[PDB]
Amino acid sequence: NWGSILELDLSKVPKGWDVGKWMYYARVNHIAVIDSFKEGTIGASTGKLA
């Protein structure tokens, strides 16, 4: 028995931010700034990807 495991995708961590510091400030503030207009979301935003 281990607790629930959350599958987390880092596709929206802002540019120039390391994952570790992003999750740290997410811990401290309980608010994690994301970037809905990353270059990797271009397909989904533009209708080229699902």
Partner: protein, 32 residues
């Protein structure tokens, strides 16, 4: 006789119309 300053323009205009009809059907699709 001959002079093609009005035939040329009308043929060119016909081809322009047909070109605009062709390009007006072009679409960049979605929903993948």
């Amino acid at each position: 006789f001959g002079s093609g300053a009005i035939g040329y323009e009308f043929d060119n205009r016909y081809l322009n119309n047909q070109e605009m009809s062709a390009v007006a059907k072009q679409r960049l699709t979605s929903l993948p």
